[model samples]
Target: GSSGSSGNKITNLEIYEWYHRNITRNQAEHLLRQESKEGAFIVRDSRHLGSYTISVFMGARRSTEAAIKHYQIKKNDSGQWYVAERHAFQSIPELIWYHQHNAAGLMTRLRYPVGLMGSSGPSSG
Candidate 1:
Protein backbone atom coordinates (compact mmCIF):
# COMPACT_ATOMS: atom_id res chain seq x y z
CA GLY A 1 0.00 0.00 0.00
CA SER A 2 2.80 2.40 0.85
CA SER A 3 4.71 1.73 -2.36
CA GLY A 4 2.00 2.75 -4.84
CA SER A 5 1.89 1.53 -8.42
CA SER A 6 -0.14 0.96 -11.61
CA GLY A 7 -2.41 -1.54 -13.40
CA ASN A 8 -2.08 -3.83 -16.45
CA LYS A 9 -2.33 -1.01 -18.98
CA ILE A 10 1.16 -0.48 -17.60
CA THR A 11 4.06 -2.93 -17.45
CA ASN A 12 6.40 -3.82 -14.57
CA LEU A 13 8.98 -1.60 -16.24
CA GLU A 14 6.43 1.19 -16.24
CA ILE A 15 5.86 0.94 -12.51
CA TYR A 16 9.57 0.43 -11.91
CA GLU A 17 10.67 3.39 -13.97
CA TRP A 18 7.83 5.54 -12.72
CA TYR A 19 8.84 5.04 -9.09
CA HIS A 20 12.59 5.34 -9.67
CA ARG A 21 12.02 8.62 -11.50
CA ASN A 22 9.93 10.01 -8.69
CA ILE A 23 11.38 8.69 -5.41
CA THR A 24 14.00 10.83 -3.67
CA ARG A 25 17.43 9.36 -2.88
CA ASN A 26 16.84 9.38 0.84
CA GLN A 27 13.49 7.81 0.26
CA ALA A 28 15.17 5.24 -1.94
CA GLU A 29 17.58 4.48 0.89
CA HIS A 30 14.68 4.38 3.31
CA LEU A 31 13.02 1.88 1.03
CA LEU A 32 16.21 -0.13 0.69
CA ARG A 33 16.52 -0.34 4.47
CA GLN A 34 13.29 -2.27 4.31
CA GLU A 35 14.04 -4.33 1.21
CA SER A 36 14.38 -7.51 3.23
CA LYS A 37 11.41 -6.46 5.35
CA GLU A 38 7.69 -6.27 4.64
CA GLY A 39 5.67 -3.45 2.99
CA ALA A 40 8.73 -2.56 0.92
CA PHE A 41 8.71 -3.01 -2.84
CA ILE A 42 10.05 -6.39 -3.93
CA VAL A 43 11.03 -7.88 -7.24
CA ARG A 44 7.76 -9.54 -8.23
CA ASP A 45 5.70 -10.12 -11.33
CA SER A 46 2.12 -9.37 -12.23
CA ARG A 47 -0.10 -12.03 -13.76
CA HIS A 48 -0.17 -10.21 -17.09
CA LEU A 49 3.56 -10.44 -17.64
CA GLY A 50 5.11 -13.88 -18.00
CA SER A 51 8.07 -12.52 -16.08
CA TYR A 52 9.15 -14.08 -12.83
CA THR A 53 9.09 -10.76 -10.92
CA ILE A 54 9.58 -7.01 -10.93
CA SER A 55 13.04 -5.62 -11.57
CA VAL A 56 13.16 -2.59 -9.27
CA PHE A 57 16.56 -2.19 -7.58
CA MET A 58 19.28 0.06 -6.27
CA GLY A 59 23.06 0.24 -6.62
CA ALA A 60 25.42 -0.76 -3.82
CA ARG A 61 26.69 2.10 -1.63
CA ARG A 62 23.98 4.39 -3.01
CA SER A 63 22.59 5.10 0.43
CA THR A 64 23.59 8.43 2.02
CA GLU A 65 24.21 9.64 -1.51
CA ALA A 66 22.54 12.84 -2.58
CA ALA A 67 21.62 14.15 -6.06
CA ILE A 68 18.55 11.97 -5.95
CA LYS A 69 15.42 11.31 -3.97
CA HIS A 70 15.23 13.05 -0.60
CA TYR A 71 11.56 12.20 -0.49
CA GLN A 72 9.09 10.37 -2.67
CA ILE A 73 6.28 11.07 -5.19
CA LYS A 74 2.88 9.64 -5.75
CA LYS A 75 -0.10 10.22 -8.07
CA ASN A 76 -3.17 11.04 -6.07
CA ASP A 77 -6.52 9.51 -6.83
CA SER A 78 -7.36 12.68 -8.73
CA GLY A 79 -3.89 12.66 -10.38
CA GLN A 80 -1.05 14.61 -8.76
CA TRP A 81 2.53 14.15 -7.64
CA TYR A 82 3.11 14.52 -3.91
CA VAL A 83 5.78 13.80 -1.28
CA ALA A 84 5.26 10.95 1.11
CA GLU A 85 6.67 8.47 3.62
CA ARG A 86 5.01 6.07 6.01
CA HIS A 87 4.83 8.87 8.56
CA ALA A 88 3.94 11.83 6.31
CA PHE A 89 2.09 12.60 3.09
CA GLN A 90 2.14 16.08 1.63
CA SER A 91 2.32 18.29 -1.45
CA ILE A 92 5.21 20.68 -2.02
CA PRO A 93 3.63 23.45 0.06
CA GLU A 94 2.60 21.08 2.80
CA LEU A 95 6.08 19.54 2.78
CA ILE A 96 7.55 22.96 3.28
CA TRP A 97 5.26 23.47 6.25
CA TYR A 98 6.15 20.12 7.79
CA HIS A 99 9.84 20.54 7.05
CA GLN A 100 9.86 23.90 8.83
CA HIS A 101 8.29 22.23 11.81
CA ASN A 102 10.98 19.54 11.75
CA ALA A 103 13.67 22.20 11.49
CA ALA A 104 12.30 24.01 14.49
CA GLY A 105 12.12 20.81 16.48
CA LEU A 106 15.63 19.74 15.53
CA MET A 107 17.17 23.13 16.14
CA THR A 108 16.56 22.86 19.85
CA ARG A 109 18.14 19.41 20.21
CA LEU A 110 20.89 19.25 17.61
CA ARG A 111 23.56 21.27 15.84
CA TYR A 112 22.60 21.62 12.19
CA PRO A 113 25.70 20.96 10.15
CA VAL A 114 27.05 18.39 12.62
CA GLY A 115 30.53 19.59 11.65
CA LEU A 116 29.64 22.63 13.72
CA MET A 117 28.72 20.52 16.71
CA GLY A 118 32.07 20.83 18.50
CA SER A 119 33.29 24.06 16.87
CA SER A 120 34.78 26.73 19.10
CA GLY A 121 34.32 30.47 19.13
CA PRO A 122 36.25 33.49 20.48
CA SER A 123 37.64 32.93 24.01
CA SER A 124 36.29 34.82 26.98
CA GLY A 125 38.34 36.29 29.89
Candidate 2:
Protein backbone atom coordinates (compact mmCIF):
# COMPACT_ATOMS: atom_id res chain seq x y z
CA GLY A 1 0.00 0.00 0.00
CA SER A 2 1.12 3.59 -0.62
CA SER A 3 0.58 6.53 1.64
CA GLY A 4 -1.86 8.93 0.09
CA SER A 5 0.02 12.14 0.61
CA SER A 6 1.06 15.07 -1.53
CA GLY A 7 4.69 14.30 -0.60
CA ASN A 8 4.86 17.85 0.67
CA LYS A 9 3.43 18.24 4.06
CA ILE A 10 4.51 21.31 6.07
CA THR A 11 4.78 19.82 9.52
CA ASN A 12 4.29 21.66 12.76
CA LEU A 13 8.07 22.06 13.10
CA GLU A 14 8.27 23.80 9.75
CA ILE A 15 5.54 26.15 10.77
CA TYR A 16 7.31 26.73 14.04
CA GLU A 17 10.54 27.69 12.34
CA TRP A 18 8.70 29.81 9.82
CA TYR A 19 7.29 32.09 12.47
CA HIS A 20 10.25 31.55 14.77
CA ARG A 21 12.40 33.17 12.07
CA ASN A 22 12.22 36.45 10.20
CA ILE A 23 13.08 37.16 6.53
CA THR A 24 12.50 40.83 5.90
CA ARG A 25 15.20 43.51 5.95
CA ASN A 26 14.08 43.99 9.47
CA GLN A 27 14.83 41.55 12.29
CA ALA A 28 14.84 38.53 10.01
CA GLU A 29 17.72 39.45 7.68
CA HIS A 30 20.38 37.38 9.39
CA LEU A 31 18.25 34.28 9.77
CA LEU A 32 16.96 34.71 6.26
CA ARG A 33 20.50 35.00 4.94
CA GLN A 34 21.43 31.79 6.67
CA GLU A 35 18.38 30.11 5.16
CA SER A 36 19.39 31.37 1.73
CA LYS A 37 22.87 29.98 2.21
CA GLU A 38 21.37 26.52 2.66
CA GLY A 39 20.78 26.54 -1.12
CA ALA A 40 17.09 26.17 -0.61
CA PHE A 41 15.76 29.72 -0.16
CA ILE A 42 16.53 33.18 -1.53
CA VAL A 43 17.28 36.34 0.41
CA ARG A 44 17.31 39.61 -1.44
CA ASP A 45 19.16 42.25 0.53
CA SER A 46 16.73 45.09 -0.10
CA ARG A 47 18.14 48.20 1.56
CA HIS A 48 15.29 50.65 2.02
CA LEU A 49 12.35 51.37 4.29
CA GLY A 50 12.91 48.29 6.49
CA SER A 51 14.64 47.24 9.62
CA TYR A 52 15.10 44.21 11.87
CA THR A 53 13.86 46.14 14.84
CA ILE A 54 11.01 47.39 12.74
CA SER A 55 9.16 44.22 13.80
CA VAL A 56 6.54 43.38 11.14
CA PHE A 57 7.47 44.76 7.67
CA MET A 58 5.65 43.66 4.56
CA GLY A 59 2.80 44.43 2.19
CA ALA A 60 -0.59 45.34 3.56
CA ARG A 61 -2.96 45.21 0.60
CA ARG A 62 -2.05 43.29 -2.56
CA SER A 63 1.31 43.67 -4.20
CA THR A 64 4.42 42.37 -2.43
CA GLU A 65 6.44 43.79 -5.31
CA ALA A 66 8.95 45.87 -3.33
CA ALA A 67 7.55 49.37 -3.74
CA ILE A 68 4.40 48.80 -1.75
CA LYS A 69 3.07 48.44 1.78
CA HIS A 70 6.18 48.85 3.99
CA TYR A 71 5.41 49.08 7.66
CA GLN A 72 7.27 48.73 10.96
CA ILE A 73 6.83 48.34 14.69
CA LYS A 74 6.77 51.39 16.92
CA LYS A 75 6.83 51.36 20.68
CA ASN A 76 5.99 54.07 23.14
CA ASP A 77 9.01 53.63 25.41
CA SER A 78 7.38 50.55 26.88
CA GLY A 79 9.57 48.07 24.98
CA GLN A 80 6.74 46.09 23.51
CA TRP A 81 6.16 44.53 20.08
CA TYR A 82 3.30 45.29 17.75
CA VAL A 83 2.88 44.15 14.15
CA ALA A 84 2.29 47.67 12.85
CA GLU A 85 3.88 49.22 15.91
CA ARG A 86 0.40 50.20 16.74
CA HIS A 87 -1.17 45.23 14.08
CA ALA A 88 -3.44 41.18 11.31
CA PHE A 89 -4.91 38.83 9.13
CA GLN A 90 -7.18 37.33 11.75
CA SER A 91 -3.81 35.55 12.16
CA ILE A 92 -0.61 36.82 10.51
CA PRO A 93 0.19 34.49 7.61
CA GLU A 94 3.67 33.84 8.98
CA LEU A 95 6.66 33.22 6.67
CA ILE A 96 4.49 32.24 3.74
CA TRP A 97 3.57 35.90 3.39
CA TYR A 98 7.19 37.08 3.54
CA HIS A 99 8.65 34.23 1.50
CA GLN A 100 6.10 35.02 -1.16
CA HIS A 101 5.52 38.78 -1.14
CA ASN A 102 8.82 39.91 0.39
CA ALA A 103 10.69 38.85 -2.70
CA ALA A 104 12.29 41.35 -5.15
CA GLY A 105 14.81 41.19 -8.00
CA LEU A 106 13.30 37.83 -8.92
CA MET A 107 16.77 36.80 -10.02
CA THR A 108 19.82 37.99 -8.10
CA ARG A 109 23.54 37.53 -8.64
CA LEU A 110 23.68 35.39 -5.55
CA ARG A 111 20.85 33.22 -6.86
CA TYR A 112 22.64 32.96 -10.19
CA PRO A 113 26.36 32.80 -9.57
CA VAL A 114 27.17 32.64 -13.31
CA GLY A 115 26.05 36.29 -13.58
CA LEU A 116 22.54 37.43 -14.39
CA MET A 117 21.23 40.91 -13.43
CA GLY A 118 23.94 42.46 -11.36
CA SER A 119 25.86 45.10 -13.31
CA SER A 120 23.72 44.68 -16.41
CA GLY A 121 20.64 45.78 -14.52
CA PRO A 122 21.97 48.15 -11.85
CA SER A 123 24.51 49.67 -14.24
CA SER A 124 22.10 52.42 -15.21
CA GLY A 125 19.61 53.10 -12.42
Candidate 3:
Protein backbone atom coordinates (compact mmCIF):
# COMPACT_ATOMS: atom_id res chain seq x y z
CA GLY A 1 0.00 0.00 0.00
CA SER A 2 2.21 2.72 1.32
CA SER A 3 5.27 0.98 -0.08
CA GLY A 4 3.82 0.90 -3.56
CA SER A 5 2.77 4.51 -3.28
CA SER A 6 6.15 5.45 -1.95
CA GLY A 7 7.91 3.55 -4.67
CA ASN A 8 5.78 5.26 -7.25
CA LYS A 9 6.89 8.65 -6.04
CA ILE A 10 10.29 8.46 -7.64
CA THR A 11 11.01 11.24 -10.12
CA ASN A 12 10.94 9.98 -13.64
CA LEU A 13 12.34 11.37 -16.86
CA GLU A 14 9.15 13.34 -17.37
CA ILE A 15 9.81 15.24 -14.17
CA TYR A 16 13.48 15.59 -15.07
CA GLU A 17 12.57 17.08 -18.42
CA TRP A 18 10.09 19.41 -16.76
CA TYR A 19 12.77 20.70 -14.43
CA HIS A 20 15.25 20.81 -17.28
CA ARG A 21 12.93 23.05 -19.23
CA ASN A 22 12.21 25.22 -16.22
CA ILE A 23 15.48 25.74 -14.38
CA THR A 24 18.41 27.97 -15.32
CA ARG A 25 21.42 26.85 -17.31
CA ASN A 26 23.57 26.74 -14.23
CA GLN A 27 20.86 24.90 -12.35
CA ALA A 28 20.37 22.59 -15.28
CA GLU A 29 24.09 21.98 -15.52
CA HIS A 30 24.29 21.42 -11.79
CA LEU A 31 21.41 19.00 -11.93
CA LEU A 32 22.88 17.11 -14.83
CA ARG A 33 26.23 16.98 -13.08
CA GLN A 34 24.60 15.83 -9.88
CA GLU A 35 22.65 13.15 -11.65
CA SER A 36 25.81 12.04 -13.35
CA LYS A 37 27.68 11.89 -10.07
CA GLU A 38 25.14 10.65 -7.54
CA GLY A 39 22.27 9.34 -9.59
CA ALA A 40 18.65 10.41 -9.10
CA PHE A 41 17.15 11.09 -5.72
CA ILE A 42 13.73 9.90 -4.68
CA VAL A 43 11.21 12.53 -3.69
CA ARG A 44 11.67 13.09 0.02
CA ASP A 45 8.78 15.43 0.65
CA SER A 46 5.26 14.21 0.16
CA ARG A 47 4.28 17.66 -0.95
CA HIS A 48 6.74 17.34 -3.83
CA LEU A 49 5.91 13.72 -4.44
CA GLY A 50 3.19 12.56 -6.79
CA SER A 51 2.39 10.85 -10.04
CA TYR A 52 2.50 13.13 -13.09
CA THR A 53 1.32 13.30 -16.66
CA ILE A 54 3.35 15.30 -19.19
CA SER A 55 2.74 16.68 -22.66
CA VAL A 56 5.35 18.34 -24.84
CA PHE A 57 4.97 20.58 -27.85
CA MET A 58 8.01 21.88 -29.70
CA GLY A 59 8.58 24.37 -32.51
CA ALA A 60 11.70 25.20 -34.44
CA ARG A 61 12.93 26.97 -37.54
CA ARG A 62 15.25 25.23 -40.00
CA SER A 63 17.97 27.85 -39.79
CA THR A 64 18.00 28.14 -36.01
CA GLU A 65 19.86 25.92 -33.62
CA ALA A 66 17.28 26.47 -30.91
CA ALA A 67 13.64 25.54 -30.53
CA ILE A 68 10.82 26.28 -28.12
CA LYS A 69 8.97 23.63 -26.21
CA HIS A 70 6.04 23.36 -23.83
CA TYR A 71 4.84 20.89 -21.26
CA GLN A 72 1.81 20.07 -19.10
CA ILE A 73 2.21 17.70 -16.17
CA LYS A 74 -0.50 16.54 -13.78
CA LYS A 75 -1.41 13.84 -11.32
CA ASN A 76 -4.81 12.34 -10.46
CA ASP A 77 -6.60 9.27 -9.21
CA SER A 78 -5.71 7.26 -12.26
CA GLY A 79 -1.97 7.87 -11.73
CA GLN A 80 0.61 9.92 -13.64
CA TRP A 81 0.67 10.56 -17.37
CA TYR A 82 1.18 13.49 -19.71
CA VAL A 83 -1.83 15.52 -20.79
CA ALA A 84 -2.62 17.46 -23.94
CA GLU A 85 -2.86 21.14 -23.21
CA ARG A 86 -2.94 24.13 -25.51
CA HIS A 87 -0.43 26.80 -24.75
CA ALA A 88 2.41 28.93 -26.12
CA PHE A 89 6.05 29.17 -25.09
CA GLN A 90 5.25 26.61 -22.40
CA SER A 91 8.84 25.82 -21.58
CA ILE A 92 10.18 29.36 -21.59
CA PRO A 93 7.87 30.85 -18.97
CA GLU A 94 9.00 28.33 -16.41
CA LEU A 95 12.66 29.08 -17.07
CA ILE A 96 12.04 32.79 -16.96
CA TRP A 97 10.04 32.38 -13.78
CA TYR A 98 12.84 30.41 -12.19
CA HIS A 99 15.37 33.04 -13.19
CA GLN A 100 13.34 35.98 -11.98
CA HIS A 101 12.36 34.18 -8.82
CA ASN A 102 16.04 33.85 -7.97
CA ALA A 103 17.36 36.91 -9.76
CA ALA A 104 18.35 38.88 -6.69
CA GLY A 105 20.88 36.36 -5.48
CA LEU A 106 22.02 33.79 -8.01
CA MET A 107 21.85 35.41 -11.43
CA THR A 108 25.35 36.82 -11.34
CA ARG A 109 27.04 33.55 -10.52
CA LEU A 110 25.73 31.86 -13.61
CA ARG A 111 28.43 30.94 -16.11
CA TYR A 112 26.06 30.32 -18.96
CA PRO A 113 24.26 32.76 -21.19
CA VAL A 114 21.32 34.70 -19.78
CA GLY A 115 18.65 33.25 -22.00
CA LEU A 116 20.22 30.21 -23.58
CA MET A 117 22.52 27.97 -21.63
CA GLY A 118 24.74 25.15 -22.87
CA SER A 119 25.55 27.08 -25.97
CA SER A 120 28.42 29.08 -27.31
CA GLY A 121 28.39 32.84 -27.09
CA PRO A 122 26.41 34.85 -29.67
CA SER A 123 29.56 35.52 -31.63
CA SER A 124 30.16 31.80 -32.06
CA GLY A 125 27.81 31.87 -35.01
- Which prediction has the highest lDDT against the true structure? 1
User: Candidate 3, 34: how far from true, in Å?
Assistant: 20
Off by over 4 Å in 3: 1-22, 25-59, 85-125
TM-score of each: 0.21, 0.22, 0.26
Clashes of each: 8, 5, 3
**What's the CA RMSD of model 1 in angstroms?**
16.3
Comparing 2 and 3 on TM-score, the stronger one: 3
Which parts of model 2 are misplaced by more than 4 Å? 1-15, 19-68, 87-125
**TM-score for predicted model 2 compared with the true structure:** 0.22
Please report the TM-score between candidate 1 and the true structure: 0.21
lDDT of 3 at 73: 44
Question: Sorted by TM-score, highest first, which candidate order results?
Answer: 3, 2, 1
RMSD for each model, in Å, please?
Answer: 16.3, 15.2, 14.9
Choose the strongest candidate by TM-score. Answer: 3
lDDT of each: 0.31, 0.29, 0.29
